[PDB]
Amino acid sequence: LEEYASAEDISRVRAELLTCPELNTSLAGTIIEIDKNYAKSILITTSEMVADDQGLIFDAFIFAAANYVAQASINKEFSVIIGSKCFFYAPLKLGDVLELEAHALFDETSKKRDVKVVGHVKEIKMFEGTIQVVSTDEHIFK
Template sequence: MIKSRTHLLVSPEWVGQTVALAEGKAEVRLTTRPEMVADDRGLVHGGFTFGLADYAAMLAVNDPHVVLGAAEVRFLAPVTFGETLLARAEIVEGSGKKRIVKCTVSTDRLVFEGIFSCFVLTGHVLDG
């Protein structure tokens, strides 16, 4: 497994733990927490699934200055408290600063799929 070069300070409790990292690919696992629940039936807010997928996409690009520019996603099934999610991301196209990353998230079933448009900047996004 190669070493992560991006998003070094994010909390694995909220965006997942890296389980595999290779050139242009990443796998990240997240076990849903009580704080992620949106209602009394245990439904996990979709933002946490999206956050996991986004983090996996950033790791697939694995550059300190990668940012998300756009995403086209589909939520395919609900997620509930206590489920473990696995995100798989892979760069499917890249030219210049732009990387297109395909990502899926699954439990025992596919729950999310998306295409992320990521950009590798020459410096930190906050540097203007």
């Protein structure tokens, strides 16, 4: 249900995204826009993320989406997250689509970056968090 971004927008990011190339976008969402220090994503909730038989969505999936769009806002090939501070104002319901925006605090020196992430369902702010992303010039395991 991408009535939230054009097919163009979406293939345009794919061609630009260096981070998490292999991530399962069905669980963490899809990146829908990116720019310097900035990224926008959407998470469509699915029955694979429920906590119960009432449609309640396990909160970690919201975090996963935030984790993904935070890294997309920096867009480095080799990065990880090292810390986070999140608020979950209300849980998602199966059928909801979450809209995330991420803004990286300006810093063209350090490899350690703070990213502010915010999540909405329609007009309601559901989630707010800061995520610390660090990057390296080579892959971490090497």
